[PDB]
Amino acid sequence: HSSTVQNDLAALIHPNTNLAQHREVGPLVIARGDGVRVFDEQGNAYIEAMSGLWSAALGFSEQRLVDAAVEQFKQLPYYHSFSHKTNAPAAALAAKLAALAPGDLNHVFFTNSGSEANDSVVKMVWYVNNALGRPAKKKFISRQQAYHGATVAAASLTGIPSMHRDFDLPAIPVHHLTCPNFYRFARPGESQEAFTVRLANELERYILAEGPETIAAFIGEPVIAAGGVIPPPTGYWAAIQAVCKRYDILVVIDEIITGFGRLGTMFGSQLYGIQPDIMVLSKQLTSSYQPLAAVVVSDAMNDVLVSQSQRLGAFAHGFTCTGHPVATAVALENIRIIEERDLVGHVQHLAPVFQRHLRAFEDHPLVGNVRGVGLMGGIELVADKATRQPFAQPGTLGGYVFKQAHKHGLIIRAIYDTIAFCPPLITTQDDIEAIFSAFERTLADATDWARSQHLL
Amino acid sequence: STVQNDLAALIHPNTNLAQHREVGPLVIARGDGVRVFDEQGNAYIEAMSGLWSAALGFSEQRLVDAAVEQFKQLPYYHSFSHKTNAPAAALAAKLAALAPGDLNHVFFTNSGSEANDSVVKMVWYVNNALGRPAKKKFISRQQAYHGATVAAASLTGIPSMHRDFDLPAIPVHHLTCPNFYRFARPGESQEAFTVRLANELERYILAEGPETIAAFIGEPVIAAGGVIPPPTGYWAAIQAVCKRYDILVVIDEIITGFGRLGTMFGSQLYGIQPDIMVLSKQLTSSYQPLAAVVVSDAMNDVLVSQSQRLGAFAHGFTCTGHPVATAVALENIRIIEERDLVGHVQHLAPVFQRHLRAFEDHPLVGNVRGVGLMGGIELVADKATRQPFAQPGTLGGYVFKQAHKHGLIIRAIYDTIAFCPPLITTQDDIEAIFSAFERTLADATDWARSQHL
């Protein structure tokens, strides 16, 4: 027990942690960062194959981000954006994001987190529809296994059952479509194109049952990340958009994870041909070196927001650190770096090698499914490959892989019994070989451990 | 280029977005102690510390140094799945020690809004765990401010924050605003007002059913709703009622925290023992986005017992416990303690309050109120009848704009002028503030005649 461990154990409530287990096993203290690696307090190295929380695009020791922070700290360490006040980095970053975003996504509202951002979206949509004299048009459509944040509103949009348990969620009008997961929900011999068609029919039937005039918006990640790295089936996004367009339902695309090159395009929306009305960004926006998120909205949306100020006085919504000069300065440098080094290009060239390494595990006895796009992938472990069936208590094996991978210098994320990989954009071919080498040893240990636990 | 960029692409918080297209932004470029400078080089005394937040002013190098030091070690890591970092852990322990009572467990967020949102979820979670599914309603107050997320803004009780947002969206009741000047009956004492306010709460609980009411939330002093200190005895009475019906007491110190009222926490000044305390703003002087929820041992025990059967506390933000933001909070608090800035406020408060009170007999001023280094000057149309103006906020709106021409940034809360200067404010700064305000108020007296009110 070091000073940090004693302090942690006394006083710190951990997010997304088994708080009871935590009292027994205690924390793992991370002390230092170096490229795609982080080091614990004892000096052990770990390849961070998840970029932290899908977030650390430029790795854990990019000096240029520190420099951008330092530069801005010396000018103006803090000011707000209320009552017409602004600062240069926020304004520049707004314009940058307006330019990068497809279509007429040209207006930016800043928050600290993805959660706050999605919460802001819910409020904006309600506000807009009230302004347009459509009081009934307020319901959001999401999907099972979606993740959209942790505030009451955002977590309501979230569709992972464990994130709702005992939190009285959803607490706002939300309907969750089935998870677009071909491996799990496709019928025998059904094509992806046919699955897409059923998924789109599911959406349309729901709209018609509820009444289109009651449905304001659809929200979705291009690829479902925290829900188990589930890429969409072929044609999914074109079908979903066509239905939304037919019934005047806003399309809200959550690129909190997919944004800034993760899928081999700057935004996942480009890869899947999505034209959002609203796009939400965070994480790789700053490599999480600073808390920042952005809501980008259409000119149409913005026009309604503005027309509301005409009759209501002010847009009565904001956070203290909305537009923080340091956080936005860091985002600007982060984006400069991604463009200048063509890291989107790098991902396109690295993706096939990353995916090939993933696919290598298809024929493993424990592996039921492998899936991935760009530089994000998942390996789902199952009890029986024939019946694609999960384990007695899902997450037992994944939980073990998560712990055991540490002993081989690897940090991954277990989503129940799916192992997730989302390495930094600066990952090299050599880093990939190191990751999967370490994972192969972990999976060997797991194969042993699973037999002695009589799980298979 | 900043203005063109702003006008093209930036949706401003808490701004008239239509007016913004016409007048455009004011670009703030540089900071120096209690001053900020625009792009054109004009100086302004920031008598609001930004948003009640910049405790150590706008150019404290030690905070930058703490940030830089931490950036070079570990610029980012998360606190999920048992992971931790040294600053987060140290800050948790520090806050656990500073907080009164058995407030010993800390959960970190980026904002006050997220923090209060977390509180709502924690309370619901705990009551579900303890087999009380109906016990979920929050009690707040008119003019309260608790944040801008759907849930937090629902707790907020400023009507303009709800307009056209379909809020509240969760079970909440708003008590009358504890504002003696405004809502006392003729010749009523503060002690009597408090008694009615406490009775109001109790009778509401009994009418709704105590088994449906989970928690009370309140700022010790209502800040954003118009710098409204509680009436005498208020907090003792409110606590007694809450205790009687097993209603959690949640104290929002997002603004009052870290010396603002002349004690480290406002809870100490007013003898409040919270079950839950919420902190932000002055926690980092807003140099980094950070907030903290501090909870009792009892609360925490239930959170822990839930992990035993659910497998996880299924709540978190990416930047929960951010090593840089927490590092900065630690240094910020170290600085407040080392310089005894709580002590500084105690010695400066009487001078600050005296300067405020000087305006009591001004023709435009109906009421002056304040505690510690927070104050408000409420402008009215008639001092006799304590009556507001035709459209509230017209005069205050003018004072806000006009003060800029005299190098002063304040905040207009409708027609109440708010003052919340940095903890590092000096006696000289105070004289400069009120000097500039006196000129502003003179301009306002002229402007009010020509507008016929």
Numbering used by the authors:
A (entry chain A): 4 to 459
B (entry chain B): 6 to 458
From the paper:
Omega transaminases (ω-TAs) can mediate the chiral amination of several unnatural substrates without the requirement of an α-COOH group and are highly relevant in the production of several pharmaceutical intermediates of commercial interest. In this work, we successfully overexpressed and characterized the two recombinant transaminases TA_2799 and TA_5182 from P. putida KT2440 and solved their crystal structures. The overall structural fold of the TA_5182 and TA_2799 enzymes is similar to that observed for other class III fold type I TAs with two α/β domains. There are two highly flexible loops present in the structures of TA_2799 and TA_5182 that mediate the entry and exit of the cofactor and the substrate/byproduct into the active site of the enzyme, leading to significant conformational changes in the enzyme structure.
The crystal structure of L322F mutant of TA_2799 was solved at a resolution of 2.5 Å. The TA_2799_L322F mutant was crystallized in its apo form, with a sulfate ion bound in the phosphate-binding pocket of the enzyme. We expected PLP electron density in the crystal structure of the TA_2799_L322F mutant; however, only sulfate ion density could be seen. PLP may have been present at the active site, but not covalently bound as an internal aldimine, and thus, the sulfate ions from the crystallization mother liquor could compete and displace the PLP molecule out of the active site pocket. In the crystal structure of the TA_2799_L322F mutant enzyme, the ND1 of the N121 residue maintains hydrogen bonds with both OE1 and OE2 of E123, which provides further stability to the anion-pi stacking interaction between E123 and F322 in the same monomer. Apart from that, the OE1 of E123 forms a hydrogen bond with OG of S120, forming an extensive intersubunit network that stabilizes the dimer. The effect of the L322F mutation is observed in the thermal stability assay, as the mutant enzyme has an increased ∼6 °C melting temperature (Tmapp) over the wild-type TA_2799. The mutant enzyme’s affinity towards the cofactor PLP is clearly enhanced as observed by the yellow coloration of the enzyme solution post-purification and the characteristic peak for PLP at 420 nm seen in the absorbance spectra of the purified enzyme, similar to the report of Kwon et al.. The mutant enzyme efficiently converts (R)-PAC to (1R, 2S)-NE even without external cofactor addition to the reaction mixture. The TA_2799_L322F mutant showed the best increase in stability; it retained ∼70% of its activity even after 96h of storage.
